[PDB]
């Protein structure tokens, strides 16, 4: 068991049962912080590159370009690990204290000052425009290799570690890749009718609004990694059974409680996911149900944020 490079060691993350959440241990968490670049995105950093290699769009010479932060760091280490140049477009602004980290992974950040994603995606596209032959944009929000990896690793890990007893999957949605791949695995590959729960911010509940056929109005929020403010292609609505919304403050406080009461070094959206699972878990409906929660990242990515 020796990996040729850091990308092949993705996954195999543990399930830890919570003591201060849910009811008689029906809430268990999957620590995705325990991945090569320390978030769940390590899995898609690996597989998006591998697939691009496999179908010929990524080759020796061509530079990976994209806009993103956990996904940036994931692509950063895979680029380094497999020998690719990489440009990651990013604003000047929020989700910072991460520059020298990405800089430390040898990424060249397109120092893009209207500070937001379009400003980057414009520069991403413009860079992408400049020379199609030299650049490849892996497009996490829609690239099928994103959900595919969760279908093949994240989901099967959950099935095996519970021995087919998972009844519920709770996961924040950024790309939707995580919940989509997981659900497909458990429901379609293993054939078990579980409840898949997408989590999103109450500040920007675009999935809740869409399914209700209500006006889609997104907004700013503090739960880094989720709440994109649109329905991403890698989000398969068809497998989603329920959508829970959680506010930034409660999410942050849930993350702090995860540290102090559970000794689990969780990131902000990990708190969002737990707060929603705790709510579900305290419904008699879910009393005899095993609830599995994805904890996307880890506390030290958040030192300079409201979490601390």
């Amino acid at each position: 068991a020796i990996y040729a490079d850091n990308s092949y060691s993705i996954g195999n993350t543990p399930l830890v049962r919570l003591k201060h959440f849910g009811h008689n241990g029906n809430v268990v968490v999957k620590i995705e912080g325990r991945n090569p670049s320390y978030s769940v995105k390590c899995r898609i950093g690996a597989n998006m590159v591998w697939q691009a290699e496999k179908d010929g769009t990524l080759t020796k010479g061509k530079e990976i370009v994209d806009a993103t932060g956990n996904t940036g760091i994931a692509l950063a280490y895979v680029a380094a690990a497999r020998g690719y140049k990489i440009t990651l477009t990013m604003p000047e602004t929020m989700s910072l204290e991460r520059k020298r980290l990405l800089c430390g992974l040898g990424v060249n950040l397109v120092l893009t000052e209207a500070k937001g994603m379009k400003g980057a995606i414009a520069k991403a596209e413009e860079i992408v425009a400049s020379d199609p032959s030299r650049y490849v944009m892996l497009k996490q929000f829609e690239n099928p290799a994103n959900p595919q990896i969760h279908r093949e690793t994240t989901g099967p890990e959950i099935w095996k570690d519970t021995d087919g007893k998972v009844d519920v999957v709770v996961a924040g949605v950024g790309t939707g890749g995580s919940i989509t791949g997981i659900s497909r695995a458990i429901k379609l590959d293993f054939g078990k009718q579980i409840t898949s729960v997408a989590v999103e911010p109450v500040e920007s509940p675009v999935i809740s609004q869409t399914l209700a056929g209500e006006e889609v109005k997104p907004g700013p929020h503090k739960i880094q990694g989720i709440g994109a403010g649109f329905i991403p292609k890698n989000l398969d609505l068809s497998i989603i059974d329920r959508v829970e919304t959680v506010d930034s403050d409660t999410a942050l406080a849930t993350a702090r409680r995860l540290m102090a009461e559970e000794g689990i070094l969780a990131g902000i959206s990990s708190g969002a996911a737990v707060a929603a699972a705790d709510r579900l878990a305290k419904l008699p409906e879910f009393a005899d149900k095993l609830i599995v929660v994805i904890l996307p990242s880890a506390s030290e990515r958040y030192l300079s944020t409201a979490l601390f």
Partner: peptide
């Protein structure tokens, strides 16, 4: 605060 693809 985060919004629209950034933070992911």
């Amino acid at each position: 605060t985060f919004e629209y693809g950034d933070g992911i």
